[PDB]
Design a protein around this nucleic acid. Sequence first.
DNA 1: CCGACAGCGCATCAGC
DNA 2: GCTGATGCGCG
DNA 3: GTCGG
Length: 326
Amino acid sequence: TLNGGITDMLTELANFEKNVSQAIHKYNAYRKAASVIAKYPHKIKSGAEAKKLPGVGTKIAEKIDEFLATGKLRKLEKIRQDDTSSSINFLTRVSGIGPSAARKFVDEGIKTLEDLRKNEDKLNHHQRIGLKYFGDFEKRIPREEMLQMQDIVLNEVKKVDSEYIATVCGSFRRGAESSGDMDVLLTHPSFTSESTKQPKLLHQVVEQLQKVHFITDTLSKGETKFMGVCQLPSKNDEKEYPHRRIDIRLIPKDQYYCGVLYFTGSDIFNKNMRAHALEKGFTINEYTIRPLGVTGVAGEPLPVDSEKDIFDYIQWKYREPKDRSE
DNA sequence: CCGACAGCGCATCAGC
DNA sequence: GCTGATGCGCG
DNA sequence: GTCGG
Ligand SMILES: [Cl-]
Ligand SMILES: [Mg+2]
Ligand SMILES: [Mg+2]
Ligand code: NA
Ligand code: NA
Ligand code: NA
């Protein structure tokens, strides 16, 4: 983190644009610049030096000059002092509360954690759970705990049907020493792009995980995506582990490689890669990579037998999960 | 300039 | 009930 | 806010 100060600033700007301005392209612009700068192997001495990097334009360069000179950014100083902006940014930290809901709550005079607690009747289900575990969802998960969680999920899945394959993705798969949550990619031979030969494939796994008290709450749930909450079991007399966010995604088995590429991320890496795919005349989602026709319409799914096959199509050297932390 | 900026599942709502 | 739009979340 | 054409 040679350039921690700068990337924090950019990230704070990004958050402002997303949460308050609701300007998503500005948000993405700031995130891209923060990311490109975070991997720059030199301590930055000037905006000019920074502007050499792709994603860092004139406006960001001037901000980096201001920051380097004074150690702060007036624009942010002001944003921090504004009550409405500060309140909105805060409320968006609750899972289920976005920019729109946040601004709406602020209108109604609901602007603090205390306000939320006393107005639970004004929250949808997801938001109520996000509030319930607000503190816990702030905490990172040590890889040691991720490992225990992996064992539980894989073993419980095995118990439901030995043919399931559960893979832990996200930052965990990228080798990080701590994770924001647990991402599980699930497959079963009875669910392919060709046919769904069994219903409740995701339900049964979710049910089994609730049975053993691993999954504690549900934010949302469909036939292919579960989003919820889980918790490690603690021993006699031990303080409980924090509750943790868990996402489970059921992907057609013959589409595993596109799925694991997606679920491994990072999010910025995915955006970069998919953007590059477009430039190369392909479109990539978690299911397939397809050529773009002359009209700009997706063609038929190209054959894929590894993650590297995807990189090959778009003429990128293969990058291991651990090098996709952008 | 000015168009493009990745892609998609689930929840909730409006309108029919 | 459905469809489509929008909010929010995931990487 | 940044970039490519
Ligand atoms: Cl924007
Ligand atoms: Mg994750
Ligand atoms: Mg994340
Ligand atoms: Na640049
Ligand atoms: Na939120
Ligand atoms: Na996740």
